[PDB]
Amino acid sequence: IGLMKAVDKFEYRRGYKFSTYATWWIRQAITRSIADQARTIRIPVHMIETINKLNRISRQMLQEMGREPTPEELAERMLMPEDKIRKVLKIAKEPISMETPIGDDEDSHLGDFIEDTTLELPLDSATTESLRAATHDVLAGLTAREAKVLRMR
Amino acid sequence: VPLDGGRFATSDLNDLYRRVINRNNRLKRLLDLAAPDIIVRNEKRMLQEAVDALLDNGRRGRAITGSNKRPLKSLADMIKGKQGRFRQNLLGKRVDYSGRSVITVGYLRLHQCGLPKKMALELFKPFIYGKLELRGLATTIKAAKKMVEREEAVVWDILDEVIREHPVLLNRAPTLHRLGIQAFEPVLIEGKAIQLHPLVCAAYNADFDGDQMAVHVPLTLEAQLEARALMMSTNNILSPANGEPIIVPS
Amino acid sequence: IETPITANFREGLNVLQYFISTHGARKGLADTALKTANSGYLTRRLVDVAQDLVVTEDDCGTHEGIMMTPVIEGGDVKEPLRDRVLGRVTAEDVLKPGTADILVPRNTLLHEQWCDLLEENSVDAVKVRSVVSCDTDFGVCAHCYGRDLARGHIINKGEAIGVIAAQSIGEPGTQLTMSSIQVKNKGSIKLSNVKSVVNSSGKLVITSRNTELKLIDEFGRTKESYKVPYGAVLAKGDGEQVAGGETVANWDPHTMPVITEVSGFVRFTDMIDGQTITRQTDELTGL
Amino acid sequence: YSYTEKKRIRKDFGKRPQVLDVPYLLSIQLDSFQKFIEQDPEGQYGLEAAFRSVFPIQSYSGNSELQYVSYRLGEPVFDVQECQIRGVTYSAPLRVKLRLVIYEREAPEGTVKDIKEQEVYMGEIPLMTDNGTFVINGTERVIVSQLHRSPGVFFDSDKGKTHSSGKVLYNARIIPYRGSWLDFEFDPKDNLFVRIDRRRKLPATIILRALNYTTEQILDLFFEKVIFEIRDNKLQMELVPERLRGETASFDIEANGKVYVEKGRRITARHIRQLEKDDVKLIEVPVEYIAGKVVAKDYIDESTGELICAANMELSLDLLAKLSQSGHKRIETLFTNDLDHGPYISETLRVDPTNDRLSALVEIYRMMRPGEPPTREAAESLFENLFFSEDRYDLSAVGRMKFNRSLLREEIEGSGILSKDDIIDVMKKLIDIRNGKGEVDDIDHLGNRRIRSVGEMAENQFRVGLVRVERAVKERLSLGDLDTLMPQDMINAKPISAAVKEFFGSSQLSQFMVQNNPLSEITHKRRISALGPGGLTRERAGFEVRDVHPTHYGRVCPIETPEGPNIGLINSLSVYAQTNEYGFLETPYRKVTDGVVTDEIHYLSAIEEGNYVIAQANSNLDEEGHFVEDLVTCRSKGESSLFSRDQVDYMDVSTQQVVSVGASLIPFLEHDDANRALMGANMQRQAVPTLRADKPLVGTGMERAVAVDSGVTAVAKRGGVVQYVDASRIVIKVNEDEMYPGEAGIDIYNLTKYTRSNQNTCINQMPCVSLGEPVERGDVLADGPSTDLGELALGQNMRVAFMPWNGYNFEDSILVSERVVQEDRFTTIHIQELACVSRDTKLGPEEITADIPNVGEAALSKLDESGIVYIGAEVTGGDILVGKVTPKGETQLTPEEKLLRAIFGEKASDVKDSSLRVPNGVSGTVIDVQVFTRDGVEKDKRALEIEEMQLKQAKKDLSEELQILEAGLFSRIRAVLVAGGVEAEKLDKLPRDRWLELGLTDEEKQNQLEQLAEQYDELKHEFEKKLEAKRRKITQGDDLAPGVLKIVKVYLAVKRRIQPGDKMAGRHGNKGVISKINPIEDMPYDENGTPVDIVLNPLGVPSRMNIGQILETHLGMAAKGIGDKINAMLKQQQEVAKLREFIQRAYDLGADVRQKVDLSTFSDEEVMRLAENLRKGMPIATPVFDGAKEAEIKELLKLGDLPTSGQIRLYDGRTGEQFERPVTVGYMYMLKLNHLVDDKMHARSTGSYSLVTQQPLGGKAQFGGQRFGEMEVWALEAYGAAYTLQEMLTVKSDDVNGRTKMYKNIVDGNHQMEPGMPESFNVLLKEIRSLGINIELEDE
C-alpha cells in the first residue's frame, strides 16, 4: 500500500532513482501498522514513540553502567520528570493468555483460576430479602401517611 | 479481565478475531485504490487463512501460533476433545456442598461413617442458619454467621440435630463400578480423618495407606430418600456383575 | 535365563540374583501403570454403546432365543447348567428325558428351586429368553433380561441396564493383562452328525469334519467332548459303553490323510510323469 | 579414628574389606559447571569454545570484522543470602573484550584502517552455589542431567512392519548434534532409499549423483567386476573358486582337462577345495551363461562413434558378438549373487528418474522446498548447506569418535562435517548387514546413550543467544557508520541474556529442589532424566526404553525410580558411577592379574566392559592368592556364567556399586522383594525432619557420607581448638602448623537459624561441639536439620509389636501410643510466609494502616501503631496480621438500605477493608516481618525500626569480625615494644593508648614504629570502606514490581503433632496411616512393665514379601539390650574398667567382621564419653549385600540376655490376661512422611465460581468443590438415582438463578429444588452458532 503511494508521488525530472524515494514510503506504511495494529489494547503513535525512546536509552545505560537503570536515574537522559517515566513504565504489560498452561502437565490453564468477582454471594442475597420483609413490617405499624411518604421519599 | 498486578489476561479468540477484521478492512482499502490484481489476490488469500484459523486452527495449513510458539486455541478446540465443553463442563462438573479427607479404619455399624466435626460444619452450613434463625438463637442470618464462625456452645448442639437421619455420599476415585459411591449416616468424631467401616473396603477397593475419599451432601428431599432407599450401604450386599456377595470379611 | 534363583528371602539373595529379579519386577510394574489407560478407554467405549438401553416393558411376548448348554469342551465341566441358567426365563415349554412333564407356563423365572429340579433329571439343554432376541422397539422387557442380580428378583421397569453392563465388563479390565485322545471315565461313545466307514481291521474310522466325540454316562447327559479330524483312527466303535483309561482315537499330527470309503482296486490313470506327477521312490524300503 | 567417630562408634557387620572409599556424591554437578565457567586456552570447553565458534565474523561486503580477545566475570552485586531475601537471581556479569578491524576496498589488502578495542558487557550468567544449586528469583533450583542418544551413525531393523511378507528391513541413520538428519533404508523390493529430515523418500543413488558420481563410478564402489575375454571364437572368464558356494550350475563346468560338476548340481565345498589344487583360473564358458548379465561400462565402437550399450544394461546374445565385432576382447560385467552379493545398488538405478548431477540437485529441491521453482544456484547451495557447511552442521567429536568407531576406522579426531568418504561408507556397511555380515544395534544400550549435564546445556543455550549477535552485527557493518562505531554501540545485551534467562527458570529440566531432607537434596542433584528437549515423552515411550538393560550394572540403579507414568524415564546415578570426557558412564573395577587381585582400579565404560570377564564382589578371597573356587561366578559378553581362576580379568570394587545412594541406606535389602524396595526407596525422600534427631540403631554404614556431602552440616575447613560456642556461632582457633604466615588464623562459622525450606519446613543448625576441645579437619561442628552427630537421622526408632489389636490396624493402619505424642517424637516445625502488597490504584493509593473500618478494638490488639503484627505474637485463624485498606468508589444503595442509614446515621467512608489475615486452620507464632518500600515513598514507623535494627547488627556482626581478629593481634601490638628492653612498670599501669611515646632509641626502632603506625592506618581504613557499602545496602529503596508501593512479608511458625490420619512409614516399603492414639495403660506390656509404642499388623508381612522388617526388628532388640546393660552399669556406678570389658566384648562378635576397634587405646575420659552415647542403644552397621546373618543376630541377643527367637510374652493392657502366643517385639526405625492430614482436609458449601462457565473453582487454595466426573455420573445412573443426579448438575454447580434459590430454601426449611438450564449448555450454544451452524431448541 505504501509502494502504490510512492508511484503516485514520484517524479523522474528530479534525477534520482526510484528506489531512493520509494524506500521512505514503504518504511512509513509498515511502521504505522505496527503502531496501530499489533497490539490488543491500542496505544497511540505518540506514546509508542516514547516507549521506543525508553528502550533505546535503557540499552545505552546498560552499556556504560553495566546495570539496569533506575527510573530515578533514567529520568535524566530523557529530559522528563520521574512521574511520567514511572507512568510510561505502567503500560509495559501485554495480555498474557487464558490458555497458558500454568501447570506443567496439560490439565490446567490460567483461565481455570480466574474468579468471577462480579455477581453476588448467597448470604448477601438472603440478607436482602430478609431486609425487604423487615421494612414491610415496621412501616405497617406506623400511621398510614407517615408510612406513605416514607415509601415515596 | 485485569489481573492483580496491573496486567490483563485475555482469551485466544480475541487475537483470532483481530486478524480477521484487520485483513478485512485492508481488503476494502485495496478495492478503493484500484490495486493491481496480484495484491488483491494475495489479500483474499490472506483473509481465507484468517477465517479458517478462527474456526479450526491447525487444519488447512500450519497452525497460527501466538507469541509463545504454542498455537492459538480456535473455536473448534473449545468443543472438541477431552478438555472441551462436552467432556469437561457438561458430562462432569465441579460441585458445591462437598469435601475430601484421608480415610482411616473404624466399632462402626454397617450403615455408618465417621465424619469430622470441622468438616461437617462447613458442609452443612446453610442447614444450621435455618435453625439458628428458627430457634430464636439469632435474630438475623448475618448474626448466625457470627455464631458459627465463633464455634459457640449452641452451634454444636444444632449441628447434632441437623446431621441426625441425614445420609451422606462417600466417593473414592476411580469409580470403576457403581459400588464406588455409597451412602452412609454420619457419626460425628473429633479429628480430621474420615472413619470407614472395614467391610465396605472391598467394594471401594480401599486400603488405609494414604487413600482419600470425597463427601457429598444430598440437598433436596428426593435426594435424601434415594440415598436411603437406593444407595445405602445395607442395600448393597450383592454384586450386580455376578450374584456373589460383596461383604466378605477380608 | 538358564539358571534359577536358588536363594530365598530368608537366606537373602545375591547381587546377580537381585539384579536379575529387577528385570521382571519393573516389567510388571510398568505394565500396571501403562494398562489402566487401555482399560479406561474400553470402559468409556462400552458405556456409549449401551447408553440408552433401559428396561421399558414387562413382557414383549416373543418366541425362543438362545439355547443354553454346558461349556464341557476340551476337558472337564467349567460351567454346569446351574451357573449359566440360574436367573434366566424359559423360552418354550421344556420337559424331561422322561417325556411329557411340562414344568412351566412357557415362561417362569428359573430360580434356585427350579435349578435343583434340573439337577435331579438328566436334562442338560434348555432354551432361555435372551436379550438379542427381544422384540421390543427401543428397549428390552423385564422377561428377556431375567433376574436383577444385585437384588435377587425379576428386574423392574426403568432400570438402566446398559450402564450396569459396561461397568461390569470394564471393572476387571485393570486386573487381567497378565495326537491321542484318552477316555478318562466310564461313559458311552456316541458320534453325532456322523459319517464313518468300517476300516481294514474291525474298528471304525471317521470320514467327515463335522463329527465330534461325545461321552454319555449312565444317566443321559454329556460330560466330555473331543474333536477328531478327517481320516483319524479310532480304537473302538460306536454305540458302546467303555470305561476310562484308553487312548481311543489316534492319528498322526503330521499326516492329513485322504482315506477312502470304497472297497475296490486302484489303478494308475490320468497321471503321466513330467506332466502332473514325478517319480520319487523311497530307496531304503522300495515300497 | 576421627573425633566425630570416637564419640559413638557404629558396630560394623561387614565381612569384605573396602578397597575404594565412597567418592564425593555431588561431583556431576560441580565438575560440570566448572568447565562452563573457567578459562582454557586450547582444550576448548564452555564459554571460550562458544566465543570461537561465532567470532570472528566479517561483514556482508567484506570491509570490516569483529575479533574476540577474552572474557571476564565480575563479582556478583549480592551474596547468596541477599538474593534469597529480595527475590533476585544470584548471578555474575560477563564482560567481553572485542576488537573491530576494518579494511578498505580501494587498496588490495589495506588491513590497518580502523581498530577500536574495548570491553563490552553482554548479559549475566547465574552462578552455581557451593552445593550445586542455583538461586533463581530467590528459590534454589537444580538443573537435572539428561540421558539422550549419542550422535553418530546407528543401524537398526524392524520385525513385522510389512505384514504380508514377514521380511526384515534394515535402516541406517546419521544423527548430528546440530543439523539435519539423514536416514537410509530398505523396502520390500530390496531397493535403497533416502529421506532427509523424515521427508518423502528418494532413491538412494539420487544423492550419489548429487555428489558428482557417474554411473561408471557408482557401479565401481559397490560391485566387483566379472571380466570376460574372447579368444576369437569362444568366451572365457577369470574365475575365482570361492564364487559358486551353493549355487546351481547353469551349464556343465569343466577344468583344463577334467569334469568336476554335472548340470543341476550344487558345487560342493569339495569342489571349492578341488579348484585351488589344480589351480585353474580361466574357464571356457558358453553363451547361455551371459544372457542375464549386466554390463558395467559404457561400450561404444571407435570406428563410427555411437554407443552399443550404456552402463547398467542387461546384456543379450545379439549384443554379445556386436561387442566382439566392435573390436573388444575385454568385457567387464557385475558380480551378482542371490545370497551373499546382492544387486541392491543396481536395482535402485532402474528406479532413479535422474541421470546427471544438475537434474539430481533439482530433485532434492522439490522435496526440501516444495512449491517453489528451483534454479541452478539455489539448488547448489541447498545441498551444500545441509551437511557440508560448518555453520549449519556439527557432528561434535563425541559424534565423530562414535561415527568412526562404528565404521571400524582408526581415527578419533576429525571434523564435524560429512564427506563423500563418510556417506558412501555408511551405504556400504548397511549393504553388508543385508548381505549377512555384521549385526544391528540397540538404542537401549548404555554405550549408545549419553549424559548431558548443566555446563553443557548452559553452553548450548549460550550459542543460541550468540547467533542473535551474528544477525545484528552483519546488519550493522554494512548499514552503520565506519569512523565512529565502537563495539559497545553495535552489541546488544537483551537477546543474549534472555536465552540464558529462559533456560534457568523455564526449562523442563530446571526444577524446584526437593528440600525436606538432606537425602532429598542429594538424590535430586544426582538424577538422570530421559525427558526434556531432545528426549522422550511420558506418552510416547514404549516398554523397551523403560526396562533394565544389563549395561545398567554399576551405572544406573534398578530400584530407584517412580512408579507412575515416569517409571523408566527418571533414573538415578549409582554410588561409584562416573562420567567419561564424552559423557558415557563408567564404573570402577579391581584389576585381577594371574589370579592375584591387584588393588589398582580401572574405570570401564559400557562398551569396554563387554570384552572382559569380571568376577563378583561376593567371591571369597584366599589371602591374595586366587579365589577359593575353580568356577568363579562372573559375567562375560553381557551374560553370567562360571569361569576359571586364571580366566578372570577384573573384579567388582564394592558390593554397593549396583545401587544408588538412597537404595543403599536400607538395611537388609537382599531380603526385601524388589517391588517393596522400590516403594521403600521412594518414601525415604519424603520424611519430614522432627523436633529432636534420633540416630538409627540398625543402619548401613552410608549415613555418615550422605550427611557430610549434602553440605547441610558445617564441617571444619582447618584443624584447631574450639574457643567460643554459642547457639548461633562457632569460633575455632586454628593450629599453628595449619596457619598460613600472614593472617591471625581464626575460623568463624555462623549457623543458619530457623529458616523456611522450599517445602515450608524448618532449617536449623545446632552446634555439636563443646568449649575447648580439639577439632580435626573434616570434623562435624554443627548438625543440620535431620542429622545427629553427622549421621543421617530421618526418623525415630520405637518399640514395635507385630500383632492384631482389635481391628485398629486392619489393612495397613498403624496404632500409636499416647507416650509417643507426649514425648514429641514426631513433632515437626513448619514455617510459612504471608505477603501483603499495597499497590497503586487509579481511585487512590492503598495504605497500610491500623485504622480499619467496621471492626472491634480487640482485633487491633495485636497490631502496632503502623498496622503490622508484633514479632512474637501468638495468632490464631482469622486474626489480622497486616492492616490494609483500599479506597472505594461510590456505592449504590438499595431502597431499604437507604433507610437504615437514614435512621441511625452511620455513613460509610472512602475506606474498604482488605487486610491480610491468618489463613484458617493455622495457629502459629510470628517470628519475622520484612518490609520493602519503593524509592521516594515515605517509610512508616516500623519500617524505620526494622532498618535501624539491621544497622546495629551490621555494626555488631562486623565488630566481632575485627575484634576477634585483634584478639590474637593485640598481643602483637604491645609486646613488640616490650621486645628488646624491659619497661614492666613503665608501660602497663598507664593508660593503654599512650604506649608509643616510650623510651626512645636510635634509628632502628623508629623504622619499626611507622609499621606500628601503618598497622593503625590499615586497620582504621579497612573498616570504613566496607561499612558504607552495607549502609547503602540497607536504607536503599528496592527494585519492586510496577505499581507496587510496599510489601510486608510475615513469617509464621506452626508446630504440628501426629494425629489419626497422618501417614507414617518405614524403610522397607511398609507405609500406613495412624488410626488411633491409644492411652498408655491400654497398650500391651511385657513382664517387666514396659509398654509397646506401636502395634503393627503381621498380615502385611508375608503377602508383600519384605522380610527386612522382621530382621531389622530382631536386630534392633539386640542393639537395645546392649544399651540397657550400659545404662544399668552407668546408673549403678560400677567402674571404668568393667565398662571397658563389656563394651570391648560387644565390639568383636562376628566371625570375620571387617573393623577392629580396641578400647585399650582409649583413655578413661574417652571411654566414659563413648559409654554415655551408647546408653540409649548400640548403633549397628549392616551393609547392603554384606550384612549380618541370623547366627550373628542370635549371638547378639544372648549378650543382652534376651530370647533368641525374638519373641517375648506380652500381657493385655485392658484385661490383664496373657496372650496365648509370644509376640515379636523389637525396635523399628519409623519415619513421618510429608502427607499430613492438616493439608488434606477440605470442605466447601458455597464459594467462588469460575468466570466463563460459572462452575465452582478447583483446589484447596481456591476453596473449590470436588469434581463429580464422568465415572461418578455412570454410577448414579446404574443405581437409578435421578434426583441426586439432577441436583448435582444444576443447583450444586452451574445453574445461576437456581442455586441462589436453593440456598434460601434451606434457610427457610423447604428442601425443594427448582432447577433451570445450566450455564455451561448455553455457552456451548453460542459457540456452535459462532461457527456458522444454526443450533436451536425446538420448543412446545
CSV table of C-alpha atoms in Angstrom, one decimal, chain D residues 244-412:
chain,number,residue,atom,x,y,z
D,244,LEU,CA,29.9,-70.8,-6.7
D,245,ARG,CA,29.3,-71.6,-3.0
D,246,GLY,CA,25.9,-73.3,-3.1
D,247,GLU,CA,24.7,-72.2,-6.5
D,248,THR,CA,23.0,-74.3,-9.2
D,249,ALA,CA,25.1,-74.9,-12.3
D,250,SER,CA,23.5,-73.2,-15.3
D,251,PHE,CA,25.8,-75.2,-17.7
D,252,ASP,CA,28.3,-78.0,-17.3
D,253,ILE,CA,31.5,-76.6,-15.8
D,254,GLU,CA,34.9,-78.2,-16.5
D,255,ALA,CA,38.6,-77.8,-16.0
D,256,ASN,CA,41.5,-77.8,-18.5
D,257,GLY,CA,41.1,-81.5,-18.9
D,258,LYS,CA,38.7,-82.8,-16.2
D,259,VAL,CA,35.0,-82.5,-15.5
D,260,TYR,CA,34.0,-81.5,-12.0
D,261,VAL,CA,30.3,-80.8,-11.5
D,262,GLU,CA,27.4,-82.0,-13.7
D,263,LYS,CA,24.4,-80.0,-14.6
D,264,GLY,CA,21.7,-79.2,-12.0
D,265,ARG,CA,24.0,-79.9,-9.1
D,266,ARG,CA,25.3,-78.0,-6.1
D,267,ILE,CA,29.0,-77.2,-6.4
D,268,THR,CA,30.1,-78.6,-3.1
D,269,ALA,CA,32.9,-77.4,-0.8
D,270,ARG,CA,34.9,-80.4,-2.1
D,271,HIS,CA,34.8,-78.7,-5.5
D,272,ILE,CA,35.7,-75.4,-3.9
D,273,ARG,CA,38.6,-77.4,-2.4
D,274,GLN,CA,39.3,-79.1,-5.8
D,275,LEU,CA,39.8,-76.0,-7.9
D,276,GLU,CA,42.7,-74.5,-6.0
D,277,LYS,CA,44.6,-77.8,-6.1
D,278,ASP,CA,44.6,-77.9,-9.9
D,279,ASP,CA,45.0,-74.0,-9.9
D,280,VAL,CA,42.9,-73.1,-13.0
D,281,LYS,CA,41.7,-69.5,-13.3
D,282,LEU,CA,40.3,-69.3,-16.8
D,283,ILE,CA,37.2,-71.4,-17.6
D,284,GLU,CA,35.6,-71.9,-21.0
D,285,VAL,CA,32.1,-70.5,-20.6
D,286,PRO,CA,29.1,-70.8,-23.0
D,287,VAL,CA,26.8,-68.1,-24.4
D,288,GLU,CA,23.8,-69.0,-22.3
D,289,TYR,CA,25.8,-68.1,-19.2
D,290,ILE,CA,25.7,-64.5,-20.4
D,291,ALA,CA,22.1,-63.9,-21.2
D,292,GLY,CA,21.0,-62.2,-18.0
D,293,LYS,CA,24.2,-60.4,-17.1
D,294,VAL,CA,24.6,-56.6,-16.6
D,295,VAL,CA,27.3,-54.6,-18.4
D,296,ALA,CA,29.5,-52.5,-16.1
D,297,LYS,CA,31.0,-49.9,-18.5
D,298,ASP,CA,30.0,-47.6,-21.3
D,299,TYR,CA,30.7,-49.6,-24.5
D,300,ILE,CA,30.9,-47.9,-27.9
D,301,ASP,CA,32.6,-48.6,-31.3
D,302,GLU,CA,35.6,-46.4,-32.1
D,303,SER,CA,35.0,-46.6,-35.9
D,304,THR,CA,31.7,-44.6,-36.1
D,305,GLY,CA,31.2,-43.2,-32.6
D,306,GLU,CA,27.8,-44.5,-31.4
D,307,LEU,CA,27.1,-46.5,-28.3
D,308,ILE,CA,26.4,-50.2,-28.3
D,309,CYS,CA,25.2,-50.4,-24.7
D,310,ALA,CA,25.2,-47.9,-21.9
D,311,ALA,CA,26.2,-48.6,-18.3
D,312,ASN,CA,23.9,-50.8,-16.1
D,313,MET,CA,22.2,-52.6,-19.0
D,314,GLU,CA,21.1,-56.2,-19.4
D,315,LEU,CA,23.2,-57.9,-22.0
D,316,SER,CA,21.7,-60.1,-24.6
D,317,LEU,CA,23.0,-62.6,-27.2
D,318,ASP,CA,22.8,-60.3,-30.2
D,319,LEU,CA,24.7,-57.6,-28.2
D,320,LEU,CA,27.4,-60.1,-27.4
D,321,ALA,CA,29.2,-60.6,-30.7
D,322,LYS,CA,28.4,-57.0,-31.5
D,323,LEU,CA,30.9,-56.1,-28.8
D,324,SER,CA,33.3,-58.6,-30.4
D,325,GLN,CA,32.6,-57.1,-33.8
D,326,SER,CA,33.4,-53.7,-32.4
D,327,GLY,CA,36.9,-54.8,-31.6
D,328,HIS,CA,36.7,-55.7,-27.9
D,329,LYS,CA,38.5,-58.8,-26.4
D,330,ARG,CA,37.8,-57.4,-22.9
D,331,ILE,CA,34.3,-57.2,-21.4
D,332,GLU,CA,33.6,-56.4,-17.7
D,333,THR,CA,30.3,-57.1,-16.0
D,334,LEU,CA,28.8,-57.1,-12.5
D,335,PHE,CA,29.2,-59.9,-10.0
D,336,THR,CA,25.6,-60.5,-8.7
D,337,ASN,CA,24.6,-63.3,-6.3
D,338,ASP,CA,21.2,-64.1,-4.9
D,339,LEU,CA,22.6,-64.9,-1.4
D,340,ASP,CA,25.8,-63.1,-0.5
D,341,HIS,CA,26.5,-60.3,-3.1
D,342,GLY,CA,23.1,-58.7,-3.8
D,343,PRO,CA,22.3,-56.3,-6.6
D,344,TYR,CA,20.8,-53.6,-4.4
D,345,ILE,CA,22.6,-50.6,-5.9
D,346,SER,CA,22.0,-51.7,-9.5
D,347,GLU,CA,18.3,-52.4,-9.0
D,348,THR,CA,18.0,-48.9,-7.4
D,349,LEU,CA,19.5,-47.3,-10.5
D,350,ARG,CA,16.5,-48.5,-12.5
D,351,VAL,CA,14.0,-46.6,-10.3
D,352,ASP,CA,16.1,-43.4,-10.3
D,353,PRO,CA,14.5,-40.8,-12.6
D,354,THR,CA,17.6,-38.6,-12.7
D,355,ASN,CA,20.6,-39.2,-14.9
D,356,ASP,CA,23.1,-36.4,-14.1
D,357,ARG,CA,24.2,-34.0,-11.3
D,358,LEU,CA,22.1,-30.9,-12.0
D,359,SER,CA,19.0,-33.0,-12.6
D,360,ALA,CA,19.6,-34.7,-9.3
D,361,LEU,CA,20.0,-31.4,-7.3
D,362,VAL,CA,16.6,-30.3,-8.5
D,363,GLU,CA,15.0,-33.5,-7.1
D,364,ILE,CA,16.3,-32.6,-3.7
D,365,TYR,CA,14.8,-29.1,-4.0
D,366,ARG,CA,11.4,-30.5,-5.0
D,367,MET,CA,11.4,-32.4,-1.7
D,368,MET,CA,13.0,-29.9,0.7
D,369,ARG,CA,11.3,-26.7,-0.5
D,370,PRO,CA,8.2,-27.9,-2.5
D,371,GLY,CA,6.1,-25.5,-4.5
D,372,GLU,CA,8.9,-23.0,-5.1
D,373,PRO,CA,10.5,-23.4,-8.6
D,374,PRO,CA,14.2,-24.2,-8.5
D,375,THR,CA,17.1,-22.5,-10.2
D,376,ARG,CA,20.7,-23.5,-10.7
D,377,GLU,CA,22.5,-21.6,-8.0
D,378,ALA,CA,19.6,-22.0,-5.5
D,379,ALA,CA,19.7,-25.8,-5.8
D,380,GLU,CA,23.5,-26.0,-5.5
D,381,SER,CA,23.6,-24.0,-2.2
D,382,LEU,CA,20.9,-26.0,-0.6
D,383,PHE,CA,22.7,-29.4,-0.8
D,384,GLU,CA,25.9,-27.8,0.5
D,385,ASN,CA,24.1,-26.2,3.4
D,386,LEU,CA,22.6,-29.5,4.6
D,387,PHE,CA,25.7,-31.4,5.7
D,388,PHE,CA,28.7,-29.7,4.2
D,389,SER,CA,28.7,-26.3,6.0
D,390,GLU,CA,30.4,-25.6,9.3
D,391,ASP,CA,27.7,-23.2,10.5
D,392,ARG,CA,24.7,-25.4,9.8
D,393,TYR,CA,26.1,-28.9,10.6
D,394,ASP,CA,28.1,-30.3,13.5
D,395,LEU,CA,28.9,-33.9,14.4
D,396,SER,CA,30.5,-32.7,17.7
D,397,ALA,CA,33.6,-35.0,18.1
D,398,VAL,CA,31.8,-37.2,20.6
D,399,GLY,CA,29.7,-37.9,17.5
D,400,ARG,CA,32.8,-38.1,15.3
D,401,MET,CA,34.5,-40.7,17.5
D,402,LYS,CA,31.4,-42.8,17.5
D,403,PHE,CA,30.9,-42.3,13.8
D,404,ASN,CA,34.4,-43.6,13.1
D,405,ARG,CA,34.2,-46.5,15.7
D,406,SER,CA,31.1,-47.8,14.1
D,407,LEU,CA,32.7,-47.9,10.6
D,408,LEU,CA,35.8,-49.7,12.0
D,409,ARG,CA,38.2,-46.8,11.3
D,410,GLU,CA,41.3,-45.8,13.2
D,411,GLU,CA,41.0,-42.1,13.7
D,412,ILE,CA,39.4,-40.5,16.8
